[PDB]
Design a binder for this molecule. Structure first.
Ligand code: FPU
Length: 253
């Protein structure tokens, strides 16, 4: 039953995150003999907009009809003192913030994590789902060796050129964002195109220029980022090609 019993759920007073339309808190959902740690998105509806409740429910339906090990999964919905979306807890939080704080993580560890992300993306691609906001801030870590894609806003610097010029989003558009995500990861959560305005990024890319190889980044991986950054979408690989290339590389090394 996706509808959860409120008596079985206990929340912490502190918020992990917040926004205009919701708050995320840590909680515990009571199960048979064990207790499960969960993240709960509590809806904030200060203008009493029935469309807001429908969005929370639409988002829960997607989480459910989109289920894979490399995506944040839905536990259920809880119609309590507020509408709540209960999901798995990704303890370590966002990838970019994690890497900024843990400079000891090795290049091998970062290949394993982005390969998992390429696995969740290969999955959304097969379901004909376009994320549109893939970035390191939307990869949440369960452990240092286990990443899950999330979609908080279900960002010009993560956009493929054909998104800016023609607003054409596709899985190949998501492949370009994945390339920026890999650059963020091997850079340890550094901001891409730092200090540049979104217009300067566009002009830089149309000159055939791309971000350099981050320090310590294996060359093979930088080569994959550059392929993710192929200007002409026709020639840009999809996620099946990207994931397979990552898989082989991670299984060899
Ligand atoms: C302390 O670290 C934190 C740990 C967290 N663990 C799990 C979930 C968290 O927040 C959320 C809240 C809402 C969402 N919605 C979400 O993705 N819907 C979109 C439809 C589903 C989706 C997923 C993948 C790809 C496309 C769409 N996803 C994470 C967490 C937040 C945290 O800190 C703020």
């Amino acid at each position: 039953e996706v509808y959860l019993d409120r008596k079985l759920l206990t929340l912490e007073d502190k918020e992990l995150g917040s926004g205009n339309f919701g708050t995320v808190k840590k909680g515990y959902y009571q199960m048979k003999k064990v207790v499960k740690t969960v993240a709960v998105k509590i809806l904030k509806n200060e203008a009493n907009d029935p469309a807001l409740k429908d969005e929370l429910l639409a988002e829960a339906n997607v989480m459910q009809q989109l289920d894979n090990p490399y995506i944040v999964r839905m536990i259920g919905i809880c119609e309590a003192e507020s509408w709540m979306l209960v999901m798995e807890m990704a303890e370590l939080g966002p990838l970019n913030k994690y890497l900024q704080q843990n400079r000891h993580v090795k290049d091998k560890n970062i290949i394993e994590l982005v390969h998992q992300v390429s696995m969740g993306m290969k999955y959304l691609e097969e379901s004909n789902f376009v994320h549109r906001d893939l970035a390191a801030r939307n990869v949440l870590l369960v452990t240092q060796h286990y990443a899950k894609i999330s979609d908080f806003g279900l960002p010009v610097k993560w956009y493929a050129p054909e998104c800016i010029n023609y607003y054409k989003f596709s899985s190949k558009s998501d492949v370009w964002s994945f390339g920026v995500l890999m650059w963020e990861a091997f850079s340890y959560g550094q901001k891409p195109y730092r200090g540049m305005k979104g217009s300067e990024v566009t002009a830089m890319l149309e000159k055939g220029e791309r971000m350099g190889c981050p320090a310590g980044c294996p060359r093979e991986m930088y080569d994959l980022m550059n392929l993710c950054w192929t200007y002409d979408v026709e020639n840009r690989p999809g996620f099946a090609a990207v994931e397979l290339r990552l898989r082989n590389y991670y299984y060899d090394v």
